[PDB]
């Protein structure tokens, strides 16, 4: 018999992004080919199967720095980190291959699906 | 020129609630008249003007335990904490006064608004 507030989840995510933009309560640095990205462990886990696995590990949960595979493109990561905090994906002809490869590595199934569809339309 | 995934914010919140239910990466205990509630500081800040003010304070941001005013009802708090993580509010005739008072104290403007409307309909 609950009532539901339609915009609550979107409003929560918007506020989490405001905390990220002001570097408030960020608890991890993600290193991608020397580029550094500050974020909230919980948001990374909520969006990515890879971060979920990493931060539920009894040893890795305590790390303040996580280094990604050297094949990961920093721009592809930046676009996906923006998507995690906003639901908006900046998908372009010039970045789609790097975005799909990064989403496959991060285990972000819905992003992988839209990249496969956009690539299939261009062939 | 971004594309948007409609269910992303809801899916993020659902995963944050799963982390709460398994006590994963919770970083604060909220004490309400001896009852204890574990939560994520970021989610509390994203939902409440009071928690936003508390955890942006240079001294309080580092506290692992926060004690609420003794007038706050633990059931009212529990219903609001559930709303924060799910967008669902268990509003009932028997709890509406405690829920409205707790939402006013926590500074959760949309909850206060729906309580005022439901109370006005009953008079």
């Amino acid at each position: 018999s609950c009532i539901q507030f339609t915009r609550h989840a979107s409003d929560v995510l918007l506020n989490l992004n405001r905390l990220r933009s002001r570097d408030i309560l960020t608890d991890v640095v993600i290193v991608v080919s020397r580029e550094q990205f500050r974020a909230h462990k919980t948001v990374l886990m909520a969006c990515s199967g890879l971060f979920y696995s990493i931060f539920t590990d009894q040893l890795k949960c305590n790390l303040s720095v996580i280094n990604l595979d050297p094949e990961i493109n920093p721009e592809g990561f930046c676009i996906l980190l923006d998507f995690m905090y906003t639901s908006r994906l900046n998908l372009r002809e010039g970045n789609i291959m790097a975005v799909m490869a990064t989403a496959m590595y991060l285990q972000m199934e819905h992003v992988v699906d839209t990249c496969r569809k956009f690539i299939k339309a261009s062939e | 020129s971004c594309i948007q995934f409609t269910r992303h914010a809801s899916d993020v919140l659902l995963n944050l609630n799963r982390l709460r239910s398994r006590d994963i990466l919770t970083d604060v205990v909220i004490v309400v008249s001896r009852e204890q509630f574990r939560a994520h500081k970021t989610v509390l800040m994203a939902c409440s003007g009071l928690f936003y003010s508390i955890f942006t304070d240079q001294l309080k941001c580092n506290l692992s335990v926060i004690n609420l005013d003794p007038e706050i009802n633990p059931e009212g708090f529990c219903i609001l904490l559930d709303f924060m993580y799910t967008s669902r509010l268990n509003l009932r005739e028997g709890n509406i006064m405690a829920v409205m008072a707790t939402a006013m104290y926590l500074q959760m403007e949309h909850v206060v608004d729906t309580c005022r409307k439901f109370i006005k309909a009953s008079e």
Binding site: C2, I3, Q4, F5, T6 | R88, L89, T114
Partner: peptide, 4 residues
């Protein structure tokens, strides 16, 4: 607010 809605009835979910």
């Amino acid at each position: 607010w809605v009835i979910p």
